């Protein structure tokens, strides 16, 4: 009886995004989308540690879904027989049966299919959540990944002028807990039900041993920095299903930043750094000025730099002495300074 | 001299709250209350540990008290002499005295009563602090609760609309921090006095051991449920005296968050998930668009999962299948389909 | 090329900040200061413990720079040749080369010169940033400040009316994580680099062994507690380089508070507790209307009480019976009370 145009969506690995219009006068749609459950092993940081993962179409975080207000959404969900556990999906951006997980519980060699109207606009995440001790265990095994619901305007600076983006990223940002050995050395297993008992145990203490965006410490850095160029504004697309984040980035800032995720409510504007609550979304915009690489970051610095998770930026253009200049280069303190009358000494 | 109407509030248990105007034209009046420590043995999780709890009325949280802004709220404070500490109050909706706990230090054997000014509108915590170190530890016992200071027209949207819930319920979150044995057996105690140093330690690591909506692992499952129509609009106040939060109703959203839970900000709208700092309360609306059962938690799953933070409400009515419906249910995997051809194998 | 007027600064210890307009007709200068590092032992509890910390001018936090919309901030670095690690400095306010880290990298006996445009008001964090590990431990060790760019009309409340404060203290956040040995005594080192490896693997477990407000437990208590009248409005400027804080001063609200610190964004009114993500400096003003102590702390108790997070204001006036009284001080129970026959018994 729902009598509407059909449109395929094929998905796309993060950190990129699928193709989609940000204003559009189509009418709402039914958006299909595929998603395959793959239980793998998986590197998850530089050492070469590996991890058994669980993920929505191979990737961690799950693919970025886009669709409009008022779409429809229905999503085949499959669990192939060469997987282990049950699976299904909830979607923090529908309304009813627990965000979907209720009504998507599906085996080793099943697949369901679930509509859901997509009648609230803003970033969301979706993740695996089969029941009791299994939800934060599938979620924190790589099972989430976010959708953006925008409105058919596109975005806003909630002073009624448009906004719109040269360019998105969305970066999903991992918790993992990997258990050591009694030399502290991390430990590997042959199948995720073989490692949950250790994992549990690390889960308990609430202190993750990893922290990664796309999957990886090191995924965004290196020959996959993310490209951009000055005077291009973009969107960057923030979640995490399970601990909190706050995210920055290092010689930007959030032009217009939706730390909650929502585009009914304003955003605010030139933020240093924002706050990704555990279990949302949020979004950020923001108009490159400088070239160089920037850092992107979660603002505990020892999550970032020890746990891995720094992405970079590389930004092409030209240099703007009158925002930033180096005076004068590094040199040796001059004979004549008289730094030990400072007030501090 | 303060020459206004008095009016005696009888409180009830969380998650509860006694009867009260949203709306009212009643002018500023003395409402009494009464709060009564009780330090008491409690079971906190389904496996049956038992806790030594210290706690206002008996309950964790203790009740929640309503009232109007300008209206003045007289504080009874009781400590019995069956009570082994000094215990003493602070509200944050309070002027003055460390919220009036410089004005409530009582032995046990000894009653106080503190008067206050309710001048600022919201939800606001309120907690024992008897000095130092005790300040912690009571609270992480049990010694808190919370307040809601109405504006006199009631709730507003924040852009010149009446708000106005069907009905209200408030989720204390505790975070509890109870000593293992060598064997990680949670310990059992005699009294408070005795739990005290080996509580102090784990408190001292910041990593709770439970994490309980009203009081208990289970609390509000089950049995006790929280009721709900499709239809009405429930206020869910939300409060933690000692650490962050992040509150997600599964399967619904927050159509009107304070999440810093001061009603002379306009709300937020269509949340996700929304922020409870430590040290505060929040609230939620929420309009219930579906039936079912709905898990309320707090979104690092790990905590709702493991460490006992999930509620639940039963919501009865008609299920509406353009909101979201099963299009296919389970079935196995077609021999056609051809998902070994997707861009992640 | 650059043709403005210069003005050198004066830095003055936290929390006491340099001599600043509010409001100015001023226009654009290029405002000059010197931050010259010092690594040394400082002692960070009052039982005595000391730490190998690192230092921009000889104070944890670094002390406060002011400035306004439009000037130019031209920072003479120093590292001293008697300091033994290379340091830089990261400006969250500046627009470029990672804040300016990548511009500003000197080895012991080297002095550098960066010039930041103030595009950007708020409240902002600075600190170093040498590269990789080096960031979080740089900065966990005390190499972190904020710099305040005010309009140049000076603070409003967001719906076109000035606010002014009568005083302004700076409040830095350090979250330190000490090495312990077998004995769970904090260990001393006789140098930075000989604590580093011990001191790595505690920030590896992302729970601090002290969170201190100006760099000790105790510091902004007894005698040097910070001073205000009745009737003042008061800004606090808080500020955590790596980790979340939640404060809230006792007794007390938030009048106006900038949670995410940044004057382009309409303060939120009458909180209870504020939020300051790691990584960034907030702003709460709040005019004081009853004397007597008030407690400033960030309400994670524990972290408060135990780890060292407590400041105090004393605050001088005549107090108000009408916001808060002591209707009846401390007495027996009376016989005759019949409290057995409440509900919660
Ligand atoms: O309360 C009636 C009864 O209807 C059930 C039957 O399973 O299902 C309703 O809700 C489902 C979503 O949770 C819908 O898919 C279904 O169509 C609707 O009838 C039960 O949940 C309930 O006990
Ligand atoms: O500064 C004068 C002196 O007055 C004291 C006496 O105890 O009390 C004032 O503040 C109290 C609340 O903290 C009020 O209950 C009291 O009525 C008011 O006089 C001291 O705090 C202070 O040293
Ligand atoms: O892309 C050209 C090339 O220019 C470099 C040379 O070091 O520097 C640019 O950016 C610096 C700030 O990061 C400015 O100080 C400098 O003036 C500007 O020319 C390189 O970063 C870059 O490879
Ligand atoms: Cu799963
Ligand atoms: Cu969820
Ligand atoms: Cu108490
Ligand atoms: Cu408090
Ligand atoms: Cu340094
Ligand atoms: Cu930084």
Not at 57 to 71: A, K, Q, R, T, Y
Request: aromatic letters at 8%; proline letters at 6%; glycine letters at 10%.
């Amino acid at each position: 009886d729902l009598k509407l145009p059909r449109q395929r969506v094929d998905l796309v690995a993060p950190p990129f995004v699928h193709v989609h219009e940000q204003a559009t006068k189509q009418g709402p749609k039914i958006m299909e989308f595929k998603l395959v459950v793959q239980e793998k092993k998986m590197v998850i940081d530089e050492k070469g540690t590996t991890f058994q993962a669980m993920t929505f179409n191979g990737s961690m975080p799950g693919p970025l879904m886009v669709v409009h207000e008022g779409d429809y959404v229905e999503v085949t969900l499959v669990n192939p027989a060469t997987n282990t556990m049950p699976h299904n999906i909830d979607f923090h951006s529908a309304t009813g049966a627990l965000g979907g997980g209720a009504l998507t519980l599906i085996n080793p060699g099943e697949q369901v299919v679930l509509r859901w109207k997509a009648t609230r606009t803003g970033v969301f995440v979706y993740h695996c959540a089969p029941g009791g001790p299994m939800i934060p265990w599938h979620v924190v095994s790589g099972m989430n990944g976010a959708v953006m619901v925008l409105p058919r305007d596109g975005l806003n600076d909630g002073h009624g002028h448009s906004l719109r983006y040269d360019r998105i990223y969305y970066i999903g940002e991992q918790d993992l807990y990997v258990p050591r050995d009694e030399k502290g050395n991390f430990k590997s297993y042959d199948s995720p039900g073989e490692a949950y008992s250790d994992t549990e145990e690390v889960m308990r203490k609430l202190t993750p041993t990893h922290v990664v965006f796309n999957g990886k410490a090191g995924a965004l850095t290196g020959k996959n920095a993310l490209n951009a160029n000055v005077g291009e504004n973009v969107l960057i697309v923030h979640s995490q299903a399970n601990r909190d984040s706050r995210p920055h980035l290092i010689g930007g800032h959030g032009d217009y930043v939706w730390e909650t995720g929502k585009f009914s409510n304003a955003p605010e504007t030139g933020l240093e750094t924002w706050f990704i609550r555990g279990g949302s979304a949020g979004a950020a915009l923001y108009k490159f000025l400088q070239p160089g690489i920037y850092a992107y970051v979660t603002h505990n610095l020892i999550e970032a730099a020890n746990l891995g998770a720094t992405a970079h930026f590389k930004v092409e253009g030209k240099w703007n002495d009158d925002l930033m200049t180096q005076v004068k280069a590094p040199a040796d303190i001059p004979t004549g300074s008289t730094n030990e009358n400072l007030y501090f000494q």
